[PDB]
Description:
Order of helices and strands of chain A: EEHEEHE
Strand order of the largest sheet of chain A: 3-4-5
Bound molecules: magnesium ion
Distance between the termini of chain A: 39 Å
Number of strands of chain A: 5
Shape of chain A: globular
Number of domains of chain A: 2
Largest interface: B-C, 49 and 49 residues
Oligomer: homotetramer
Radius of gyration of chain A: 18 Å
Number of helices of chain A: 2
Helix content of chain A: 10-25%
Amino acid sequence: DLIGDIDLSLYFDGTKDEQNPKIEQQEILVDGDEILGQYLIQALIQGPSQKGSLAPILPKDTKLLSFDIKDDIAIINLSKEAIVNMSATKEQATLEGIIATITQIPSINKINILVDNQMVDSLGGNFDISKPFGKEDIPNLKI
Amino acid sequence: IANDLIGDIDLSLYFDGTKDEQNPKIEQQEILVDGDEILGQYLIQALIQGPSQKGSLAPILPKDTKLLSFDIKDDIAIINLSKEAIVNMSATKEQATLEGIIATITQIPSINKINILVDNQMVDSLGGNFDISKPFGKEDIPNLKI
Amino acid sequence: IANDLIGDIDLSLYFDGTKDEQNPKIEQQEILVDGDEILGQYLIQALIQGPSQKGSLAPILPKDTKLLSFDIKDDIAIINLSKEAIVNMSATKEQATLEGIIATITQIPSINKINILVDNQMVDSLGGNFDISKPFGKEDIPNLKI
Amino acid sequence: DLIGDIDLSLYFDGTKDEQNPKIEQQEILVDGDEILGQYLIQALIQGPSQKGSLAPILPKDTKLLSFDIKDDIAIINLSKEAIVNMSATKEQATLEGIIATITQIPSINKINILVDNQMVDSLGGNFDISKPFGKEDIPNLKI
Lengths: 143, 146, 146, 143
Ligand SMILES: [Mg+2]
Ligand SMILES: [Mg+2]
């Protein structure tokens, strides 16, 4: 029950002489799980339906820099906008929301949040996000 | 649109990233494999190996020749060979060599000319009868005779 | 439908077909370039060259190791190495080596297992701690410990 | 005024285990001139319109084994069915017809007819087709 590795081609600008515009392919190999996970994180950042009563878990201006799956860990690389001052209850909902959403992909059991391609102590908040973590690890990461 | 035969392939090389002797770990190092360069490189290697002994064709480069590097700059194939490629040749044999390399390499659409180098440097000639000081295509061969 | 990354490319090698010393002539000799084999071969060569000195990663194979041949039989990559690949290694280092080769090679969709050979022959182990007597994939590594 | 080199893929049978049928690509590189020339020779073999008064130049059962362009020579490889007993006038029309048709491709100035991948003395007839020839060479090849 999956998509598996996907052969995709990206066309970038391969023009040098500027007389004739030309595009060249760059092939990439990704498993469906990264594409799906990436879509999910992007969906969380977009926020809940305005027709509902739910509240967002990440700032609207947050940008997903990259998403990668190393073994059973989802490396979620966010921009600086994700770091804001939050209450311990709100920050805990954010981390539980990301985990509950991402762990829907069976291959993923833990998440490792990074900011600007670098490791960070916390998004909010009172939670330590220095290393990878799963649902079980949340209460133990309070500071 | 570019007519590259295979095009770039963005992949990873997994090397040893171990710290804790308890858990072996591998980390990626990116490699942008340029398909036309790997294909071209394979073709030149194939020419150096020579024709099948089961056929009647003759070699175009010495067997001990070694391909130092192969790179594609725009539409030019920089074929960097070792010193063994430079030997005494007749004008008819040397012309077949240059035409053979061109005919083989120009199969890669992105390539229209070749620039042969020896030991990462420029050379006047392989055999003695043709000037390979600058890049050249099929059309340029008769004009390079010396 | 097959998911070969590059697939076969049917081309020609132009060698010297001259008879009349007056007219230099080149004749074709066909070459079926198997793209996945040339890519795989390039990747293994890249692993042997080692990681960038500008990084922190460590090599997985000795630098003097030489790739004798690389072939793809069905979904198995036959990686034929020279005697230099066999050295004394710790079980953690040897495991990283095998996982690194697999992780690198299995990027080519057509490959699911690797069969390492030394000097065109079968071998029990590279480092001493793992059995590489038969073909193996990622899943099979823990079961091959000796 | 041409088509130039054309990157084409042929899908053949790459199944071995017979459980899952699989096709694999074989890439080929041909210039438009060979494809066009090949089409023209195939059109000549099919013959003239039945609604006209023209007669065929090659037997209907003739099969084109291969068509290749070496420099300015069109190597037209036909099957054994092309060799039949012909009058010198009919055979001359055949050779002139093939040449007039093929030389429409500017890159071609001569033709080299082969039968079953091998060299042949004549198709009909009184004409020597042992080597490559153009329009000018026809009268000189009578035997
Ligand atoms: Mg390039
Ligand atoms: Mg194959």
